[PDB]
Amino acid sequence: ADLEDNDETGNDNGKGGEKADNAAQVKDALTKMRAAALDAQKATPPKLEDKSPDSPEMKDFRHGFDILVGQIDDALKLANEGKVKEAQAAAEQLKTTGRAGNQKGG
């Protein structure tokens, strides 16, 4: 049976956990982008619906979520082993880079 009829489930914020303390909010942010790459995979097809394991779709996906996962680990250690200012700096250099292919198999 469906549940629904929910309202006291924090509908006044839907979150209330952005922390915004010091470097902590940066880690939750990096982890957010992490699940985005996987969720974007064969789970929540962003705009695929016309490729599937056909052509480099596999590698760009593997090599794609790998880069994101690769910088998420590098950026997270910075937040831990670094302050939020030093950590936010990493986002700046990663902001211009971040993605790279976007096309090909996508």
HEC string for 12-23: CCCCCCCCCCCC
Q: Which residue has the tokens 């996906």?
A: 61
For residues 72 and 30, what is the distance between their CA atoms, to the nearest angstrom? Answer: 6
Number of neighbours of residue 26 by Cβ within 10 angstroms: 25
DSSP structure class, residue 33 = H
Instruction: Tell me the domains of the chain and their CATH numbers.
Output: 22-106 (1.20.120.10)
For residues 29 and 38, what is the distance between their CA atoms, to the nearest angstrom? Answer: 15
For residues 36 and 33, what is the distance between their CA atoms, to the nearest angstrom? Answer: 5
For residues 18 and 5, what is the distance between their CA atoms, to the nearest angstrom? Answer: 26
For residues 75 and 91, what is the distance between their CA atoms, to the nearest angstrom? Answer: 8
Experimental approach taken: NMR
Within the chain, what is the greatest distance between any pair of CA atoms?
A: 49
